[PDB]
Amino acid sequence: NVTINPGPFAQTGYAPVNWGPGEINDSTTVEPNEDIVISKTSLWKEMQYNRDITIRFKFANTIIKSGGLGYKWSEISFKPANYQYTYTRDGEEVTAHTTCSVNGVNDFSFNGGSLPTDFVVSKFEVIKENSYVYIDYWDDSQAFRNVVYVRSLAANLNSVMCTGGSYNFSLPVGQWPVLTGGAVSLHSAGVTLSTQFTDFVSLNSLRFRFRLAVEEPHFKLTRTRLSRLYGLPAANPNNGKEYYEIAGRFSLISLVPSNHDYQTPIANSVTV
Amino acid sequence: NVTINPGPFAQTGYAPVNWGPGEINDSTTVEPLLDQVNEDIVISKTSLWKEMQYNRDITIRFKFANTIIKSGGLGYKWSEISFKPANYQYTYTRDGEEVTAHTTCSVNGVNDFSFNGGSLPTDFVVSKFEVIKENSYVYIDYWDDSQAFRNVVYVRSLAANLNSVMCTGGSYNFSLPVGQWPVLTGGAVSLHSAGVTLSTQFTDFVSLNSLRFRFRLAVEEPHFKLTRTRLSRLYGLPAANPNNGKEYYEIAGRFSLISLVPS
Amino acid sequence: EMQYNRDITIRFKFANTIIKSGGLGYKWSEISFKPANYQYTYTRDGEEVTAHTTCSVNGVNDFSFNGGSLPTDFVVSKFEVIKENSYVYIDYWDDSQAFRNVVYVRSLAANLNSVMCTGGSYNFSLPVGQWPVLTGGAVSLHSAGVTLSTQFTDFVSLNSLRFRFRLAVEEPHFKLTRTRLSRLYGLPAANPNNGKEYYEIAGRFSLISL
């Protein structure tokens, strides 16, 4: 036997990672000294990748009915949504997956008196200037391997205009009131990278941040005294669209184990 | 046999980072009107690094806080009682070298409740007063001035074994304009540990970073009740007077750290 | 004195051994070679012939990859490669009038051709994380001298000739992905057959028997 000895500068590297989504807003309602060295010196490098990206997101909602005759309501609000798809980068296809949540929500209500059969809506949520629209991007692209130790990231994403649909409430007797309209402009403000450490393993997620400014088509509430409010409701946000689309390029810089040329058994070559 | 070895190397280091608090879940309420090509480049040359684990002894101090808002007409109608994040600053002695720290507490997974004493313009209407019971998590963010927290960027594994603390509630008087006014008292929760989490933010200016020490709750005694109303003996924590007139609750333990630090 | 000199066709296939350790699924302790056997029928001179063969190696180079000592890290203590400081042995028995007159021999030699052995992919199984994969490798065999030996893979012992070979590496390079290593030359033991039942060799041999 012959044994190739190992080199002095040991190999070390990243720990296992399975990408996923970050922490997500939630809610629920009810009705009545020392140091030690693990591995010796190792070798590393810095790089700057550049690539094209396309993202697709769906909003989703939940409506529940207030226990009673049926003219009352309990809550209409946003819900985490997920999507899966595939698209071709200049080189080849890539499969991706997206999770959309929301925060900075605003809430409203209508209370047309109190009679057994009256129309009431206790919480209907809307998006406005004080709001953000997070998005998470877990991918199979070759680049995402070297995105654990990241110095910097940035993006040049352009704008998009989300528009609202129409909802019709299910009253037992009388004209059905409806909620239609609304739209908000989404723009980019930053990015966030999160890691969750469990049992010498890491679960991580990369998510974009957005800031939102208002648009012309106002959503409105029929059969009531609401004053032409701006903002996006949650009843029919996606509006009969399979999805929205955004694209751009993100420049990433990260430490990478250097696949350096020097260490190899002496004489590794085709013979002569 | 034997293998090859390299010559002189470059000097590389961390990028400047400043500690900051975590992004926090929030909601705001509104009162009604009346009653190209694909390419790569190399920025820097080969460098030197290593993996040295650290171990530290921690004591974290936290505090809750709340909001209360009342609507305009004739009183008797409280719209919102809710939690809110808070901040604290302290110096704790470790191995003979004082370390300043800052802490920020937030909550998630809340449960809501309500009580409509009646529909007349004179009655006790409470819309939202929150609680936490087996379906809620309490998040804590923690900074420092010490060395360990200087090199906590680029982490390989971070774990900790902290102890539990039981928290109780206080009482808030719903002092109306008229009549014998009612009272809310009670509160009991146990704080256990779950994972740690690192959270980084990128932008044109300097980057920000913050930790989140997750905790999980298990409900315990004593129960809580609202006097002068029918809801009774529910089990959990309210948000009117969470800290029983105490400036701080404490935790202790030891946390192990690993990171890539230059040679 | 009597003379025999007939044509021949040889077939063979390597075999590999893999052993796991640690109980977590991330660490492997050895990936090596072992002897194997093959059996076949061919028709050289208008007459059928049946046969048995074994393949072996000596002079194996041993490489290693010790990543982190932490419990979750990819460790493969030793895996073998057959670079130039090596040799190969083969043994051939057949059913024919020859090989009943092989013993008590005087002279023996051969004029065989050459072949090309290539590597194949091996997919590790980690519980979580991307899957490291070992792929590639190249080596070619060249003739050398022959001498008698006994292939006892069957219950009965046989009398058989042993053909030795010398090795020379070639272009396709073997690499372990998801690690620092790349562009190493040789032939691993992880998957040498490459989806082929067997390689093939041809030629003739001359023996003088008594």
XYZ file of C-alpha atoms in Angstrom:
745
model
C 0.000 0.000 0.000
C 1.014 3.642 -0.402
C -0.577 6.457 1.559
C -0.884 10.063 0.385
C -0.352 12.202 3.477
C -2.654 15.105 4.054
C -1.585 18.745 3.721
C -0.825 21.091 6.660
C -3.611 23.604 5.963
C -6.742 21.579 6.734
C -9.982 21.533 4.854
C -12.965 23.102 6.662
C -16.163 24.338 5.133
C -19.813 25.248 5.427
C -22.261 23.200 7.525
C -25.257 21.510 6.077
C -28.144 23.866 4.997
C -31.728 23.309 3.828
C -33.271 26.577 2.593
C -36.801 27.518 3.630
C -38.871 30.583 4.635
C -38.201 33.028 7.508
C -40.333 33.739 10.607
C -43.893 34.741 9.664
C -46.527 36.916 11.279
C -49.339 35.064 13.015
C -52.372 35.651 15.181
C -55.466 33.928 16.493
C -58.936 35.089 17.497
C -61.698 33.669 19.652
C -65.401 34.395 20.121
C -67.801 33.610 22.982
C -14.571 31.870 30.252
C -12.671 29.653 27.799
C -11.707 29.250 24.095
C -10.674 26.125 22.180
C -9.626 25.425 18.559
C -11.652 22.962 16.464
C -9.744 22.919 13.136
C -6.418 24.464 12.293
C -5.824 27.159 9.744
C -7.723 26.856 6.475
C -7.742 28.814 3.212
C -10.523 31.053 1.892
C -11.264 33.528 -0.939
C -13.679 36.373 -1.764
C -15.822 36.602 -4.930
C -18.584 38.646 -6.562
C -21.282 36.774 -8.452
C -23.868 38.331 -10.761
C -26.999 36.690 -12.121
C -30.519 37.316 -13.422
C -33.602 36.559 -11.341
C -37.371 36.384 -11.782
C -39.799 36.228 -8.843
C -43.514 35.395 -8.716
C -45.808 35.792 -5.710
C -49.504 35.211 -4.837
C -51.331 36.904 -1.968
C -53.940 34.716 -0.140
C -56.757 35.386 2.321
C -59.017 33.944 4.945
C -62.570 34.836 5.798
C -64.425 33.301 8.724
C -68.106 33.948 9.631
C -69.146 35.449 13.041
C -71.412 32.943 14.891
C -75.026 34.214 14.609
C -77.866 34.836 12.075
C -75.306 35.433 9.186
C -75.437 39.179 8.727
C -72.319 39.453 10.949
C -68.699 38.784 10.128
C -65.591 38.026 12.166
C -62.432 38.686 10.207
C -61.158 39.142 6.640
C -57.344 39.108 6.510
C -54.070 38.151 4.796
C -52.558 34.693 4.939
C -49.119 33.359 4.064
C -48.976 32.126 0.485
C -46.593 29.864 -1.421
C -45.801 29.242 -5.044
C -43.533 26.954 -7.076
C -42.280 27.410 -10.610
C -39.480 27.197 -13.142
C -37.770 29.727 -15.394
C -34.763 29.893 -17.670
C -31.732 31.963 -16.809
C -29.391 32.865 -19.648
C -27.701 29.532 -19.115
C -30.353 26.995 -18.197
C -33.592 26.254 -16.402
C -33.978 26.651 -12.650
C -36.805 25.695 -10.298
C -37.689 28.075 -7.478
C -40.184 28.480 -4.742
C -41.572 31.636 -3.160
C -43.391 32.509 0.123
C -45.265 35.785 0.541
C -46.302 37.290 3.860
C -47.100 40.781 5.025
C -46.655 43.147 7.971
C -47.391 46.694 9.019
C -51.034 45.973 8.399
C -53.815 48.453 9.020
C -57.314 47.381 10.078
C -60.796 48.899 9.666
C -64.386 48.001 10.523
C -67.974 48.955 9.914
C -70.686 48.958 12.516
C -74.031 49.933 11.099
C -75.728 49.896 14.512
C -76.810 46.845 16.526
C -79.989 45.001 15.527
C -80.229 41.255 15.186
C -80.160 41.363 11.405
C -77.737 44.256 10.782
C -74.559 44.178 8.625
C -71.334 44.292 10.674
C -67.710 43.627 9.721
C -65.254 43.671 12.624
C -61.792 43.431 11.116
C -61.025 43.964 7.398
C -57.342 44.516 6.799
C -55.750 46.888 4.333
C -52.231 47.806 3.214
C -51.085 51.447 3.223
C -47.990 53.650 3.498
C -47.062 52.201 6.844
C -46.625 48.704 5.430
C -44.133 46.273 4.030
C -44.444 43.149 1.723
C -41.837 40.465 2.491
C -40.938 37.774 -0.045
C -38.785 34.618 0.445
C -36.825 32.921 -2.389
C -35.559 29.302 -1.857
C -33.713 28.110 -5.081
C -31.941 25.226 -6.856
C -29.558 27.470 -8.764
C -25.867 26.731 -8.464
C -25.188 30.177 -6.970
C -27.181 29.636 -3.834
C -24.583 27.177 -2.556
C -22.095 29.937 -1.674
C -24.653 32.212 0.056
C -24.074 31.115 3.662
C -21.306 33.490 4.627
C -22.334 36.728 2.853
C -20.598 40.138 3.125
C -22.966 42.018 0.867
C -25.990 41.784 -1.394
C -28.029 44.212 -3.290
C -30.530 44.313 -6.104
C -31.777 46.597 -8.888
C -35.435 45.518 -8.943
C -37.920 47.639 -10.861
C -41.551 48.525 -9.843
C -44.908 46.588 -9.986
C -48.606 47.649 -9.551
C -50.886 45.198 -7.622
C -54.693 45.608 -8.170
C -57.695 44.409 -6.211
C -60.764 42.520 -7.325
C -64.335 42.340 -6.072
C -66.012 40.361 -3.251
C -69.754 39.820 -2.710
C -71.070 39.200 0.794
C -73.627 36.446 1.372
C -76.577 38.114 3.070
C -79.732 36.049 3.664
C -82.300 38.707 2.720
C -81.524 41.923 0.851
C -79.082 43.466 -1.584
C -75.652 41.925 -1.467
C -73.017 44.527 -0.523
C -69.675 44.281 -2.092
C -66.039 45.328 -1.769
C -64.164 46.104 -4.950
C -61.153 48.092 -5.982
C -57.854 49.123 -4.593
C -54.244 48.952 -5.657
C -50.739 49.689 -4.292
C -47.274 50.225 -5.788
C -44.489 47.933 -4.564
C -40.848 49.124 -4.685
C -37.553 47.674 -3.184
C -35.882 48.809 0.028
C -33.511 46.058 1.103
C -32.868 42.407 1.828
C -32.649 40.154 4.909
C -30.790 36.815 5.507
C -31.799 34.660 8.466
C -30.222 31.546 9.955
C -31.763 29.181 12.585
C -29.186 27.049 14.415
C -30.226 23.583 15.590
C -28.041 20.570 16.434
C -24.886 21.632 14.565
C -27.146 22.277 11.570
C -28.462 25.417 9.938
C -31.850 26.359 8.398
C -31.746 29.601 6.483
C -33.822 31.962 4.369
C -33.268 34.972 2.128
C -36.111 37.487 1.910
C -36.621 40.798 0.176
C -38.249 43.854 1.699
C -40.568 46.223 -0.115
C -42.142 49.570 0.673
C -45.544 50.511 -0.636
C -47.023 53.809 -2.014
C -50.719 54.307 -3.041
C -52.471 54.485 -6.491
C -55.623 55.859 -8.086
C -58.286 53.120 -8.086
C -59.888 53.318 -4.648
C -61.433 50.300 -3.021
C -64.863 51.002 -1.640
C -67.584 49.440 0.533
C -71.096 49.319 -0.889
C -74.253 50.093 1.158
C -72.376 52.121 3.772
C -70.806 55.439 4.820
C -67.082 54.587 4.225
C -65.220 57.597 2.754
C -63.450 56.388 -0.400
C -60.400 54.992 1.341
C -57.060 54.303 -0.359
C -55.091 51.095 -0.016
C -55.270 47.428 -0.835
C -57.847 45.189 0.860
C -57.552 41.441 1.311
C -60.731 40.030 -0.132
C -59.685 39.530 -3.782
C -56.136 40.837 -3.975
C -54.697 38.754 -6.790
C -57.721 39.555 -8.977
C -57.958 36.594 -11.303
C -54.242 36.680 -12.085
C -52.217 33.506 -11.706
C -49.343 35.606 -10.394
C -47.366 38.813 -10.607
C -43.780 39.019 -11.919
C -40.689 41.073 -10.973
C -37.084 40.525 -12.309
C -33.615 41.960 -12.031
C -30.009 41.327 -11.073
C -28.514 40.908 -7.604
C -24.794 41.335 -6.998
C -23.534 39.009 -4.179
C -20.060 38.897 -2.517
C -19.096 35.943 -0.253
C -16.290 33.855 1.285
C -15.820 30.609 -0.614
C -13.690 27.716 0.183
C -10.849 28.342 -2.204
C -10.663 25.518 -4.696
C -7.019 26.370 -4.778
C -4.652 24.595 -7.201
C -1.652 23.979 -4.950
C -2.376 20.990 -2.702
C -2.354 17.718 -4.679
C -0.247 14.588 -4.712
C 3.018 15.462 -6.444
C 2.951 14.142 -10.016
C -0.771 14.034 -10.746
C -0.816 14.149 -14.542
C -1.247 12.034 -17.574
C 1.965 9.955 -17.848
C 4.562 10.502 -20.535
C 4.413 10.306 -0.005
C 3.879 14.064 0.391
C 2.080 16.998 -1.240
C 2.561 20.607 -2.317
C 2.487 23.801 -0.150
C 1.828 27.608 -0.954
C 3.727 30.971 -0.388
C 2.722 34.539 0.906
C -0.964 35.359 1.576
C -3.286 38.358 1.821
C -4.912 40.081 4.794
C -8.711 40.039 4.945
C -11.201 40.799 7.677
C -14.788 41.377 8.617
C -16.783 44.191 7.097
C -17.915 46.885 9.503
C -21.207 45.926 11.228
C -23.279 47.579 13.944
C -25.665 45.825 16.283
C -29.360 46.758 16.194
C -32.768 45.394 17.266
C -34.830 42.848 15.366
C -37.650 43.531 12.901
C -40.840 43.457 15.029
C -44.394 42.290 14.320
C -46.784 45.228 14.458
C -50.302 46.398 13.585
C -51.981 49.825 13.724
C -55.694 50.495 14.307
C -58.157 53.048 13.012
C -61.149 54.469 14.876
C -64.438 54.892 13.000
C -65.847 58.311 12.211
C -68.807 58.344 14.696
C -70.300 56.326 17.581
C -28.217 41.314 -19.667
C -25.322 38.860 -19.537
C -24.494 36.561 -16.610
C -20.959 37.116 -15.131
C -18.437 36.647 -12.258
C -15.352 38.517 -10.957
C -12.835 38.152 -8.090
C -12.620 40.958 -5.538
C -9.833 39.698 -3.245
C -7.047 37.078 -3.204
C -6.551 33.957 -1.052
C -6.672 34.550 2.672
C -6.232 32.841 6.022
C -8.860 31.859 8.608
C -9.594 29.277 11.350
C -12.416 28.003 13.573
C -12.131 28.803 17.303
C -15.109 27.983 19.487
C -15.995 30.286 22.340
C -17.945 29.642 25.519
C -19.558 32.365 27.609
C -21.733 32.810 30.708
C -24.796 34.958 30.100
C -27.451 36.668 32.167
C -30.232 38.438 30.120
C -32.660 40.929 31.617
C -36.046 41.678 29.824
C -39.215 43.752 30.316
C -42.662 43.837 28.677
C -44.843 46.855 28.096
C -48.391 47.747 26.968
C -50.670 50.318 25.273
C -54.215 51.371 26.115
C -56.472 53.467 23.912
C -60.066 54.604 24.612
C -62.659 55.840 22.080
C -64.334 59.221 22.176
C -67.936 58.940 23.340
C -69.051 58.815 26.949
C -66.382 56.388 28.003
C -67.209 52.848 28.979
C -65.814 51.569 25.621
C -62.157 50.546 25.523
C -61.003 49.622 21.996
C -57.478 48.339 22.462
C -55.277 46.784 25.140
C -52.146 45.331 23.559
C -48.580 44.379 24.101
C -45.656 46.476 22.855
C -41.906 45.953 22.616
C -39.575 47.497 25.184
C -35.892 48.062 25.874
C -33.510 47.838 28.867
C -29.733 48.463 29.580
C -27.594 46.788 32.272
C -24.104 45.797 33.501
C -23.521 42.216 34.706
C -20.230 40.982 36.183
C -18.597 38.061 34.315
C -15.176 36.745 35.300
C -14.225 40.097 36.691
C -14.790 42.292 33.601
C -18.054 44.247 33.433
C -20.061 43.911 30.203
C -22.808 46.393 29.159
C -25.775 44.828 27.360
C -29.068 45.978 25.868
C -32.262 43.794 25.518
C -35.503 44.088 23.446
C -38.632 41.976 23.958
C -41.312 41.236 21.353
C -44.159 38.734 21.073
C -45.770 36.715 18.303
C -48.644 34.244 17.996
C -50.949 36.187 20.278
C -54.523 35.263 21.141
C -57.299 37.874 21.242
C -60.487 38.124 23.278
C -63.518 40.362 23.649
C -66.414 41.213 25.960
C -69.556 43.212 24.871
C -71.459 43.955 28.057
C -74.237 45.340 25.918
C -75.245 47.482 23.015
C -76.484 50.582 24.826
C -74.307 53.730 24.794
C -73.750 53.077 28.551
C -72.092 49.688 29.025
C -68.735 47.900 29.196
C -67.405 47.318 25.624
C -63.914 45.794 25.351
C -62.828 44.870 21.853
C -59.260 43.564 21.978
C -57.180 42.635 25.092
C -54.471 40.109 24.262
C -53.074 36.962 25.859
C -50.381 34.305 25.315
C -51.155 30.594 26.094
C -49.396 27.602 24.398
C -49.839 29.188 20.949
C -47.563 32.172 21.442
C -43.840 32.724 21.388
C -41.843 35.463 23.094
C -38.785 36.738 21.256
C -35.799 38.415 22.892
C -33.008 40.277 21.125
C -29.637 40.754 22.878
C -26.569 42.958 22.213
C -23.231 43.365 24.015
C -19.928 45.220 24.172
C -17.778 42.074 24.792
C -15.421 40.282 22.443
C -17.529 37.267 21.827
C -20.170 39.447 20.296
C -17.540 41.170 18.161
C -16.719 37.987 16.230
C -20.215 36.458 16.212
C -20.601 37.260 12.513
C -19.932 34.304 10.095
C -21.257 31.648 12.537
C -21.000 27.841 12.007
C -23.027 26.751 15.096
C -24.632 28.589 18.024
C -26.390 26.904 20.912
C -27.229 27.634 24.482
C -28.603 26.042 27.599
C -30.457 28.640 29.656
C -32.787 28.024 32.695
C -36.575 28.778 32.853
C -38.428 31.685 34.647
C -42.136 31.792 35.677
C -43.931 35.141 35.102
C -47.117 36.399 36.731
C -49.535 39.203 36.070
C -50.866 42.300 37.745
C -54.140 44.182 37.958
C -55.573 47.093 35.937
C -58.591 49.073 37.147
C -61.164 49.822 34.454
C -62.081 52.994 36.313
C -65.271 54.249 34.669
C -66.920 57.590 35.270
C -69.724 55.921 37.244
C -70.523 52.875 39.292
C -68.414 50.315 41.044
C -65.681 49.821 38.458
C -64.291 46.454 37.378
C -60.896 44.712 37.613
C -58.679 42.323 35.593
C -56.048 40.235 37.517
C -54.017 37.071 37.073
C -51.322 35.645 34.865
C -49.021 32.612 34.793
C -46.524 31.503 32.143
C -43.339 29.421 32.087
C -40.494 30.377 29.744
C -38.545 27.510 28.184
C -35.823 27.598 25.548
C -35.892 26.773 21.828
C -33.253 27.686 19.208
C -31.182 30.875 18.756
C -31.373 32.690 15.413
C -29.107 35.250 13.702
C -30.627 37.871 11.475
C -28.750 40.050 9.001
C -29.906 43.054 6.965
C -28.213 44.442 3.851
C -28.453 47.868 2.275
C -26.399 50.636 0.716
C -25.121 51.876 4.087
C -23.574 49.783 6.844
C -25.166 46.428 7.550
C -27.154 45.635 10.729
C -27.299 42.412 12.680
C -29.342 41.035 15.598
C -29.955 37.815 17.523
C -33.284 36.284 18.528
C -33.460 33.966 21.516
C -36.687 32.033 21.022
C -38.639 30.856 24.031
C -41.693 28.524 24.242
C -44.490 28.871 26.763
C -46.297 26.344 28.939
C -49.260 27.582 30.953
C -49.343 27.200 34.720
C -51.145 28.581 37.809
C -52.635 30.856 39.041
C -55.594 31.438 36.750
C -56.862 34.851 35.748
C -60.329 36.330 35.751
C -62.126 39.583 34.961
C -64.390 40.703 37.734
C -67.970 41.915 36.947
C -68.116 39.896 33.637
C -68.844 36.322 32.545
C -65.528 35.244 31.111
C -63.991 33.220 34.010
C -60.979 31.230 35.036
C -59.310 31.167 31.610
C -55.606 30.108 31.744
C -52.834 32.340 30.374
C -51.207 35.728 30.558
C -52.916 39.071 29.932
C -51.253 42.263 28.734
C -52.578 45.047 30.940
C -50.086 44.698 33.835
C -47.702 41.950 32.801
C -44.718 42.639 35.072
C -45.961 42.525 38.667
C -44.480 45.874 39.460
C -40.977 44.487 38.910
C -38.399 46.290 36.820
C -36.928 43.106 35.431
C -37.036 39.314 35.141
C -33.664 37.404 34.780
C -32.350 34.285 33.039
C -28.813 32.694 33.359
C -26.835 30.107 31.481
C -23.957 29.296 29.213
C -23.779 29.648 25.458
C -21.274 28.020 23.087
C -20.174 29.846 19.955
C -18.130 28.909 16.816
C -17.014 31.276 14.060
C -14.466 31.858 11.337
C -11.897 34.430 12.671
C -8.711 35.494 10.910
C -5.169 34.411 11.727
C 6.959 -33.014 -26.124
C 3.747 -31.408 -27.444
C 2.710 -27.965 -28.597
C -0.451 -25.919 -28.104
C -1.068 -22.297 -29.164
C -4.653 -21.111 -29.394
C -6.580 -17.809 -29.532
C -8.390 -16.330 -26.547
C -10.902 -13.750 -25.305
C -10.924 -12.526 -21.711
C -13.708 -10.803 -19.761
C -13.654 -9.287 -16.286
C -15.318 -6.846 -13.901
C -14.077 -5.259 -10.665
C -16.017 -5.201 -7.412
C -16.040 -2.685 -4.580
C -16.567 -2.583 -0.823
C -18.120 0.249 1.193
C -18.481 0.411 4.968
C -20.251 3.022 7.082
C -19.703 4.083 10.673
C -20.895 6.485 13.328
C -24.639 5.978 13.205
C -25.353 9.561 12.085
C -24.998 8.918 8.358
C -22.316 11.514 7.597
C -19.112 9.516 8.001
C -17.635 6.678 5.899
C -14.572 4.591 7.039
C -13.386 2.843 3.816
C -14.184 2.558 0.073
C -11.877 -0.095 -1.514
C -11.666 -2.983 -4.097
C -12.086 -6.780 -3.664
C -11.718 -9.810 -5.915
C -14.643 -10.862 -8.092
C -15.644 -13.456 -10.643
C -17.330 -13.718 -14.029
C -18.454 -16.731 -16.198
C -19.083 -16.737 -20.010
C -19.409 -18.515 -23.394
C -17.636 -17.536 -26.636
C -16.817 -19.171 -29.952
C -13.170 -18.794 -31.061
C -12.480 -21.598 -33.547
C -15.828 -23.038 -34.447
C -16.026 -24.626 -31.021
C -17.716 -23.249 -27.915
C -15.709 -22.701 -24.751
C -16.997 -21.992 -21.174
C -14.851 -20.223 -18.594
C -14.202 -18.533 -15.229
C -12.106 -15.458 -14.401
C -11.086 -13.373 -11.390
C -9.812 -9.793 -11.120
C -7.554 -8.341 -8.443
C -5.272 -5.442 -7.654
C -2.164 -4.669 -5.636
C -0.269 -1.473 -5.080
C -3.249 0.713 -4.314
C -2.898 4.388 -3.533
C -4.915 5.614 -0.550
C -6.346 9.180 -0.406
C -8.431 10.722 2.382
C -10.718 13.665 3.224
C -11.075 14.737 6.889
C -13.287 17.790 7.017
C -14.446 19.068 10.348
C -14.164 17.100 13.570
C -17.652 18.446 14.539
C -20.377 15.741 14.557
C -22.120 16.889 11.392
C -19.410 17.049 8.657
C -18.459 14.892 5.650
C -15.640 12.525 6.556
C -14.333 9.651 4.329
C -11.335 8.164 6.070
C -9.771 6.307 3.173
C -10.744 5.722 -0.439
C -8.486 4.013 -2.944
C -7.258 5.016 -6.369
C -5.145 2.915 -8.802
C -2.601 5.405 -10.251
C 0.667 4.195 -11.857
C 2.340 2.627 -8.748
C 0.026 -0.383 -9.066
C -0.480 -3.672 -10.861
C -3.350 -5.907 -11.927
C -3.701 -9.697 -11.997
C -6.187 -11.911 -13.856
C -6.754 -15.681 -13.966
C -8.431 -17.671 -16.769
C -9.743 -21.193 -16.905
C -11.770 -22.725 -19.708
C -13.140 -26.110 -20.754
C -11.188 -27.455 -23.697
C -8.487 -29.942 -24.646
C -5.972 -27.389 -23.488
C -5.848 -26.683 -19.749
C -5.832 -30.424 -19.287
C -2.192 -30.327 -20.557
C -1.147 -27.081 -18.892
C 0.713 -28.510 -15.933
C 4.335 -29.535 -16.400
C 4.856 -26.603 -18.769
C 8.080 -25.299 -20.380
C 7.528 -21.996 -22.218
C 4.683 -19.464 -22.031
C 4.019 -15.994 -23.434
C 1.326 -13.711 -24.799
C 0.608 -10.862 -27.329
C -2.548 -9.253 -25.945
C -4.129 -5.924 -26.859
C -5.119 -2.998 -24.617
C -8.297 -1.484 -23.188
C -9.596 1.571 -21.370
C -11.203 1.487 -17.932
C -13.294 4.508 -16.937
C -14.963 5.626 -13.751
C -18.586 6.267 -12.940
C -20.711 8.342 -10.616
C -21.302 7.549 -6.948
C -23.976 9.412 -4.984
C -23.481 9.721 -1.253
C -26.481 9.802 1.086
C -26.536 12.671 3.537
C -29.627 13.223 5.697
C -29.710 16.942 4.889
C -27.836 19.244 2.587
C -26.669 18.861 -0.951
C -25.276 15.497 -1.980
C -21.540 15.219 -2.557
C -20.798 13.194 -5.668
C -17.619 11.449 -6.822
C -17.254 11.231 -10.565
C -14.669 10.483 -13.161
C -11.435 8.647 -13.500
C -9.449 7.013 -16.261
C -6.828 4.324 -16.642
C -5.702 1.941 -19.375
C -4.145 -1.513 -19.167
C -1.094 -2.825 -21.077
C 0.319 -6.356 -21.295
C 3.059 -7.982 -19.287
C 4.266 -11.503 -18.579
C 2.200 -14.563 -17.698
C 2.633 -17.534 -15.242
C 0.554 -20.429 -13.787
C -1.871 -20.071 -10.744
C -4.965 -21.769 -9.172
C -8.463 -20.262 -9.365
C -10.565 -21.947 -6.684
C -13.665 -19.760 -6.802
C -15.531 -22.965 -7.543
C -15.617 -25.865 -5.097
C -13.174 -27.840 -7.238
C -9.689 -26.411 -7.700
C -8.612 -25.443 -11.164
C -5.306 -25.036 -12.979
C -5.068 -21.738 -14.768
C -2.852 -19.111 -16.332
C -2.353 -15.662 -14.778
C -2.058 -12.615 -17.013
C -0.464 -9.564 -15.342
C -1.012 -6.008 -16.610
C 0.643 -2.630 -16.217
C -1.237 0.640 -15.950
C -1.135 4.144 -17.427
C -3.484 7.029 -16.552
C -5.375 9.162 -19.054
C -7.426 12.296 -19.410
C -10.818 12.075 -17.707
C -10.171 13.406 -14.199
C -11.944 12.171 -11.097
C -13.348 14.787 -8.741
C -15.337 14.957 -5.500
C -17.868 17.774 -5.716
C -18.933 19.916 -2.758
C -15.411 19.910 -1.488
C -12.122 21.687 -2.206
C -10.752 18.771 -4.247
C -10.860 18.871 -8.051
C -8.792 17.673 -10.986
C -7.204 14.567 -9.545
C -6.097 11.781 -11.923
C -6.528 8.062 -11.460
C -9.313 5.519 -11.031
C -11.319 5.300 -7.800
C -13.009 2.243 -6.469
C -16.370 3.814 -5.967
C -17.807 2.721 -9.305
C -15.305 1.328 -11.775
C -17.509 -0.866 -14.041
C -19.605 2.059 -15.261
C -22.804 0.303 -16.219
C -20.979 -2.305 -18.272
C -21.219 -5.983 -17.452
C -17.633 -6.446 -18.576
C -14.691 -5.133 -20.512
C -13.154 -7.206 -23.311
C -9.643 -8.273 -24.329
C -8.377 -10.381 -27.234
C -5.242 -12.095 -28.443
C -3.474 -15.430 -28.383
C -1.052 -17.326 -26.153
C 1.611 -19.997 -26.857
C 2.451 -22.760 -24.412
C 4.684 -25.837 -24.876
C 3.584 -28.823 -22.711
C 4.806 -32.343 -21.966
